[PDB]
Structure formats: C-alpha cells, structure tokens
Amino acid sequence: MENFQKVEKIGEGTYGVVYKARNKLTGEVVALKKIRLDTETEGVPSTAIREISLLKELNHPNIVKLLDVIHTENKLYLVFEFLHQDLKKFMDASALTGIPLPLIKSYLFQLLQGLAFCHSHRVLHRDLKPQNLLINTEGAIKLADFGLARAFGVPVRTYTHEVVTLWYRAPEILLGCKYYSTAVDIWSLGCIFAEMVTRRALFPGDSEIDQLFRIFRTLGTPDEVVWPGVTSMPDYKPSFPKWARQDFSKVVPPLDEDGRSLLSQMLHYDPNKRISAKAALAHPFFQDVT
Amino acid sequence: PDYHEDIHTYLREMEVKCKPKVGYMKKQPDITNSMRAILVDWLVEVGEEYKLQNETLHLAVNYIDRFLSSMSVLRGKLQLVGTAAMLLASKFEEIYPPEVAEFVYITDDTYTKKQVLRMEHLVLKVLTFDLAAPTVNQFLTQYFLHQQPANCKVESLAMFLGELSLIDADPYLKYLPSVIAGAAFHLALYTVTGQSWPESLIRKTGYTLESLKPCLMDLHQTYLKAPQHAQQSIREKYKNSKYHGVSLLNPPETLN
Ligand SMILES: CC[C@H](CO)Nc1nc(NCc2ccc(O)cc2)c(N=O)c(NC(C)C)n1
Numbered sequence: 001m002e003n004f005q006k007v008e009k010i011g012e013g014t015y016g017v018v019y020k021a022r023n024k025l026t027g028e029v030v031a032l033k034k035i036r037l038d039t040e041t042e043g044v045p046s047t048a049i050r051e052i053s054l055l056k057e058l059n060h061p062n063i064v065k066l067l068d069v070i071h072t073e074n075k076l077y078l079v080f081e082f083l084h085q086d087l088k089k090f091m092d093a094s095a096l097t098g099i100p101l102p103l104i105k106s107y108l109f110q111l112l113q114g115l116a117f118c119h120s121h122r123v124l125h126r127d128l129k130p131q132n133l134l135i136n137t138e139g140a141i142k143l144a145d146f147g148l149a150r151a152f153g154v155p156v157r158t159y160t161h162e163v164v165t166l167w168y169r170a171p172e173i174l175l176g177c178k179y180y181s182t183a184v185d186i187w188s189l190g191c192i193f194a195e196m197v198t199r200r201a202l203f204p205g206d207s208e209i210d211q212l213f214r215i216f217r218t219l220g221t222p223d224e225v226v227w228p229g230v231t232s233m234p235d236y237k238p239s240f241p242k243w244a245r246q247d248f249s250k251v252v253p254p255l256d257e258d259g260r261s262l263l264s265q266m267l268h269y270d271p272n273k274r275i276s277a278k279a280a281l282a283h284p285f286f287q288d289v290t
Numbered sequence: 291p292d293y294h295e296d297i298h299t300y301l302r303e304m305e306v307k308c309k310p311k312v313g314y315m316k317k318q319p320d321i322t323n324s325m326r327a328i329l330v331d332w333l334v335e336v337g338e339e340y341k342l343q344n345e346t347l348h349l350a351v352n353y354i355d356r357f358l359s360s361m362s363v364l365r366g367k368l369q370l371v372g373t374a375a376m377l378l379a380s381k382f383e384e385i386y387p388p389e390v391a392e393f394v395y396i397t398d399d400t401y402t403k404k405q406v407l408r409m410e411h412l413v414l415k416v417l418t419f420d421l422a423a424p425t426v427n428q429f430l431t432q433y434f435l436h437q438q439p440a441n442c443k444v445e446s447l448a449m450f451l452g453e454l455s456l457i458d459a460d461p462y463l464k465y466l467p468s469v470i471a472g473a474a475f476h477l478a479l480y481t482v483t484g485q486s487w488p489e490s491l492i493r494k495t496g497y498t499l500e501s502l503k504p505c506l507m508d509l510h511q512t513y514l515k516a517p518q519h520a521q522q523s524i525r526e527k528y529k530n531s532k533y534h535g536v537s538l539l540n541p542p543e544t545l546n
Pocket residue numbers: 008009010011012013018020031032033064080081082083084085086131132133134144145
C-alpha cells in the first residue's frame with residue numbers, strides 16, 4: 001500500500017471505507033475499499049468474501065471491475081477501477097431539467113445487461129439503488145457494491161431476510177415470503193427507472209408498513225386474483241387498506257406506451273410473473289436505444 | 291427458466307476450472323487418502339452439530355482438496371486446514387455462520403483462534419479468494435426438477451450417495467461434480483422407483499447412461515460396501531427421519 005496516495009474520501013460502503021486514490025508509480029486512478037480486520041476478531045467478513053469471490057466471476061462492461069486484493073496481516077484492501085460519479089449524485093445535479101429520455105433509456109438498458117449477466121451466473125445483487133450505480137465520462141453505467149450479494153441455487157433455498165435498502169425493497173421481502181430470487185433485483189431497477197423519470201424516489205417509506213402502503217397506493221393493494229397466496233403471507237394483514245391502482249400516466253407522466261408497459265412489468269406483484277432482466281432487454285421500449 | 295439453462299451452462303464451465311489436481315496425494319509426503327477420509331467424515335459431524343447445510347460441507351471439501359493440490363501439510367496440521375475451510379464455506383454459504391470460537395471448540399482446543407484465523411488468511415491467499423465453486427449438490431438440486439412431483443426418498447438417497455463420494459479421493463476425485471451427481475441421481479432413482487436417468491436430463495446435460503457408467507460402477511460399489519466402510523458419520527446422518535432413513539434401504543444387487 002506504500003504505492004497508493006489517497007486523494008479523497010468517497011464514502012462508507014456496505015462495510016468499511018472507500019477512497020479515491022492514485023498509484024504513485026503508474027499514475028492509475030483507483031477506488032480503494034478498506035476493511036479493518038482487527039476490529040471484528042471473527043476473521044475476514046462474509047460480505048468481503050462474497051464480494052471478492054463473486055466479482056472475480058463477473059467480468060462485464062456494466063459490472064464494476066475488481067483489479068486487485070491486497071491482504072495485510074492487519075488490513076484488507078479491494079482495489080477497483082475508479083468512476084467519477086454515482087447515479088444518486090447525477091440525479092441531484094439534473095433535478096430540475098430532468099435526465100434526458102434517451103440517456104434514461106440507455107442507462108436502464110446497460111443496468112439490465114449487467115443484471116442479466118449477474119443472474120446468468122447465479123448471483124443476486126440485493127442492494128440495487130442509485131448510490132451503488134456508477135457512471136464514467138464515456139456514458140457507461142455499472143453495477144457496484146456486491147457486499148450484500150450472494151450466489152444462488154436452482155431452485156433457491158431461504159436466504160437472508162434483511163436485504164435491500166427499504167425504498168428499493170420488493171413486496172415479497174416486506175411480506176416475508178419464504179423464498180425470493182432474481183425478481184427482487186428487477187423490482188429495484190423498476191423503482192430506479194421511475195426515479196430517473198420523475199426526479200424523486202418512487203416509494204420513499206420510513207418503515208416496513210409505510211413502505212408497503214406507498215406501494216399499495218400506487219399499484220393497488222394486491223389480492224388473491226393478482227397475486228395468488230398473498231393474503232396468506234406471514235406479514236400480510238387483513239386490515240390492510242384496499243387502494244385502487246393508479247393510472248400509469250399519473251405515476252410516470254413523461255413516458256410513452258412502451259415505457260409504461262415495461263415499468264408495470266418490472267413492478268408486477270407476483271414475482272413469478274415479474275419480467276426477467278433478459279426479457280426486459282427484448283422489450284419494444286429498447287428498439288431505438290443508443 | 292430464462293437463465294436456468296444459462297446457470298447450468300455456466301456451472302459446467304466452472305467445474306472444470308475449480309477442479310483439484312487428480313493425483314495430489316501421491317505428492318504429499320506426510321498425509322494420505324485415509325487421513326483425508328477421516329477429516330471429511332469429521333466435517334460431516336461438525337455440519338450435524340451446527341446444523342449447517344449440505345452445500346457448506348461440499349464447498350469445504352472443494353476448498354481442502356484445492357489447497358492440498360498446491361501446499362504441503364503435516365498430518366498434525368491437516369485438521370487446521372479443514373477447520374478454516376469449513377469456516378470459510380460457512381461464511382460464504384450460511385445465513386448464520388458459527389463463530390470462530392465454536393469452531394475452536396469442536397477441535398477440542400487442538401488449535402487456537404489465532405491459528406484458525408491465520409489459516410483462514412492462508413487458504414484465501416492460496417485459493418486466490420475463488421470460493422464460488424460448483425458442487426455435486428448444486429447439480430443435484432437441478433437434476434431433481436426433472437422428476438415431478440418430487441420424490442423425497444429419491445432426493446435424500448441421491449444426496450446420501452453424493453455425500454459418500456466426498457469421503458474417498460480414490461476414485462471420486464477423477465470425476466466432475468456434474469457426473470457424480472448424475473450417477474447419484476440415476477442410482478437413487480433406480481433403487482427407489484425402478485426408473486432410470488430420464489430423457490429430459492440426457493437433453494439438458496448431454497450425458498447418457500453409458501457416459502455415466504464408469505462413475506456409476508464405482509458409486510454402486512461404494513453404496514454396496516458402505517456398511518463396512520471405516521468412516522460411518524454419513525450413514526448415521528442419513529438414518530434420521532429428516533432424510534427418510536434412506537441409508538437403511540437395501541442397495542440394488544445389479545444395475546443391468
Ligand atoms: C459509497 C460507496 C459507493 C460504492 O458503491 N460509492 C462509490 N463511488 C464511486 N465513485 C463515485 C464518486 C466519485 C467521487 C466522489 O467524491 C464521490 C462518489 C466509486 N468509484 O469507483 C466507488 N467505487 C467502488 C467500486 C469501491 N464507490
């Protein structure tokens with residue numbers, strides 16, 4: 001680590017600290033993810049073990065590139081490529097005028113390519129949100145932060161329940177389904193799609209119950225017809241208010257028919273019928289992507 | 291469905307790459323297949339004591355064989371390797387991995403916490419953090435989808451047979467996980483229902499009964515001779531009703 005100079009604190013991740021840094025010999029700009037091992041006394045954390053192992057299996061233009069892992073007796077550094085901006089910050093800087101529609105389509109297309117690849121290599125990301133999506137000056141967008149990720153099986157077993165940041169969390173998680181899978185990632189991308197178009201979070205809940213009710217108010221409270229088994233789910237309550245589905249031209253006003261159709265399929269309640277990353281790429285919405 | 295085919299394709303590709311060197315034990319000066327078998331059988335019991343998944347056990351065995359493919363270990367350190375491997379596999383695979391102190395405890399203080407953690411670092415270094423390995427179990431659960439409705443006895447017996455293969459480096463290190471799984475599933479299907487390796491799986495995998503035959507010949511023998519094997523923890527495990535007592539069922543005498 002002698003050869004890296006720290007330039008600035010980027011932030012805190014799923015664990016540890018991120019720095020922008022420069023290789024003092026080559027000039028190469030990187031992002032360093034530091035993990036202090038002595039302050040856990042349980043060894044290398046699972047978050048780190050999974051991020052590293054799964055990233056070495058995920059080489060793709062829309063997945064952030066892990067360059068090296070430097071493993072001291074005292075510390076552990078993941079060395080990644082550096083990208084200059086995250087999507088959350090880009091949305092804030094475009095908060096008035098909007099992100100132009102072709103760039104929103106381009107970014108969604110790229111995010112889906114990255115995600116289809118993850119799912120094709122049996123990886124669930126489980127923390128898709130604008131803060132974890134990184135953009136370079138070339139117009140590329142990349143999935144980042146695989147610390148909450150996990151390698152899944154066919155078919156799936158029960159996995160960790162405390163997953164996905166609240167605003168981006170799928171209804172099958174909130175309602176406590178025994179099984180979840182790739183669909184939870186699609187839900188998150190659907191929320192991100194809509195957030196790019198409207199310039200604000202689609203479902204900004206402050207609790208699990210508040211989150212559910214915001215989803216219900218927009219999409220309609222689900223019943224046995226739209227989602228078989230829903231009223232029997234662990235955290236489903238018969239007292240839940242019955243709201244009617246809002247017309248998608250109030251939910252996402254700037255979008256054409258194709259856009260609205262793709263969003264509705266990404267936010268489909270029944271995870272079995274929610275569109276796949278692969279099928280989403282073949283949606284008519286993308287026939288003119290650049 | 292979209293990506294189920296792709297996952298299968300991708301795992302078939304990684305099982306070649308995450309294979310250990312077949313004859314590594316010849317090149318180990320102080321340790322043998324017999325000591326390896328003792329270690330794996332002990333890991334089965336650790337898995338039972340901590341109610342760990344079968345996938346975790348299978349991943350641990352992968353890690354151990356890979357490590358011993360490139361590193362010389364004295365016999366009194368072989369258990370330390372196995373402990374660190376089981377810890378790593380637990381972190382990868384489990385929702386609630388046991389803590390390091392519990393792992394020290396099941397070695398009966400043969401090692402310290404410090405030793406287990408330093409070995410964890412060394413195993414990670416030697417395997418270059420490549421822990422997402424295909425296992426027999428990952429192929430089995432896919433193969434099981436091609437019997438509808440699921441026969442829980444077949445599934446438990448197939449798992450049992452796949453687990454026994456972990457115990458004996460000779461001959462099972464020369465087969466790939468997808469092949470062992472295929473043999474295991476045919477054998478389990480045949481024992482319980484009289485059915486064979488289905489047409490749908492010949493299409494999915496590209497394996498015929500005849501390509502499975504050499505592994506199936508070995509696995510039949512291992513099954514027949516299981517009650518007399520020196521290692522017995524797997525047989526004991528699979529007596530429980532959780533696994534429909536399938537280790538008590540009589541192996542077929544011939545396969546035709
Ligand atoms: C806060 C942690 C996240 C990681 O999801 N932010 C982030 N931002 C990154 N860049 C956007 C950014 C750049 C400069 C800043 O001052 C702030 C954000 C970034 N660069 O690659 C990066 N790299 C990870 C792969 C470790 N991580």
